[PDB]
């Protein structure tokens, strides 16, 4: 049953991800709690944020880079358990599960990223802090170059105004993608992806009645995410080749192997 298929993915989304877009958006607006997030806009406030774990300190731009690794790695662990909560996904052999996570987590991460982003920055520390975009721009290359492209995508992505129910299905479609290199059972995954996209279109018709061309637009965003991630990978291989003092989390090294 497709209606129940969708609802199961929605529950897995709520059960496995720390913050919903509804949570984040209320913070970024200021309705939620009378204590707004602590703004990190420069070195001082960055230091104050740390006061109130990671590899040896090298410098500020690299410190930010490590904080980013921690969030990506943490989000990978949530995507893994969210995917595992999808019965269709757990029926695949374990190696096929790894292939899809290896080549899908980053696409899923930059799509979820938009939920905690606005034109001015993003949330950190579970909504307790807000890092400004101008500050992340002030970092030295190539760390400023690896951050700014995501904001440009996030702002155009938020213009679609998806709610958490849309995103749950949207993320499952990104993970269950038959195009990944080295997949063993392509037709199985192709079928699963087709069921999700069908349920996604069915969902959007109900959830966004007066939103036209929303489904083809999201398919275009999926294509955009492949471009964004591929560019991100090149910049990562740049850091690995030119930033000797910058280490990489082993899990991410396996993804970029």
Ligand X SMILES: CCCCCCCO[C@@H]1O[C@H](CO)[C@@H](O)[C@H](O)[C@H]1O
Ligand Y SMILES: O=C(O)CCCCCOc1ccccc1CN(C(=O)c1ccc(-c2ccccc2F)cc1)C1CC1
> Applying CB under 6 A, which residues contact ligand Y?
40, 46, 64, 67-69, 71-72, 75, 106, 109, 113, 122, 124, 131, 136, 146-147, 150, 236, 252
In order of 6, 7, 93, 108, the CA distances from 166 in angstroms are 10, 11, 27, 13
**How near is the Cβ of 78 to ligand Y at its closest, in Å?**
11
**How near is the Cβ of 185 to ligand Y at its closest, in Å?**
27
- Positions touching ligand X (CB under 6 A) are 76, 80, 93-95, 98-99, 101-102, 182, 251, 254-255, 257
Radius of gyration, CA atoms only, the chain: 19
Pairing outcome for strands 38-40 and 121-124: unpaired
Binding partner of residue 246 among ligand Y, ligand X, none, CB cut-off 5 to 8 Å per kind = none
**How near is the Cβ of 177 to ligand Y at its closest, in Å?**
18
Nearer to ligand Y by C-beta: 3 or 140? 140
Nearer to ligand Y by C-beta: 149 or 178? 149
Binding partner of residue 69 among ligand X, ligand Y, none, CB cut-off 5 to 8 Å per kind = ligand Y
Binding partner of residue 124 among ligand Y, ligand X, none, CB cut-off 5 to 8 Å per kind = ligand Y
Q: How many CA atoms lie within 13 A of 87 on its CB side?
A: 7
Binding partner of residue 241 among ligand X, ligand Y, none, CB cut-off 5 to 8 Å per kind = none
């Amino acid at each position: 049953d497709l209606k129940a298929f969708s609802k199961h993915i929605y529950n897995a989304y709520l059960k496995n991800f720390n913050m919903t877009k509804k949570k984040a958006r209320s913070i970024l607006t200021g309705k939620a709690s009378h204590t707004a997030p602590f703004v990190i806009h420069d070195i001082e406030t960055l230091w104050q944020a740390e006061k109130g774990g990671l590899p040896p300190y090298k410098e500020i731009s690299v410190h930010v880079f490590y904080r980013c690794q921690c969030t990506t790695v943490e989000t990978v662990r949530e995507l893994t358990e969210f995917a595992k909560s999808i019965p269709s996904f757990s029926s695949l052999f374990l190696n096929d599960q790894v292939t899809l996570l290896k080549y899908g987590v980053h696409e899923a991460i930059f799509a979820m990223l938009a939920s905690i982003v606005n034109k001015d920055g993003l949330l950190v520390a579970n909504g307790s802090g807000f890092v400004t975009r101008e500050f992340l721009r002030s970092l030295r290359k190539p760390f400023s170059d690896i951050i700014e492209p995501k904001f440009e995508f996030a702002v155009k992505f938020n213009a679609l105004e998806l709610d958490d129910s849309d995103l749950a299905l949207f993320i499952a479609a990104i993970i269950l993608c038959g195009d990944r290199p080295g997949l063993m059972n392509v037709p199985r995954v192709e079928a699963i992806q087709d069921t999700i996209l069908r349920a996604l279109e069915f969902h959007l018709q109900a959830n966004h009645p007066d939103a036209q061309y929303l489904f083809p637009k999201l398919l275009q965003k999926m294509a955009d995410l492949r471009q964004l991630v591929t560019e991100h990978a090149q910049m990562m291989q740049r850091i690995k080749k030119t930033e000797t003092e910058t280490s990489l989390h082993p899990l991410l090294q396996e993804i970029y192997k």
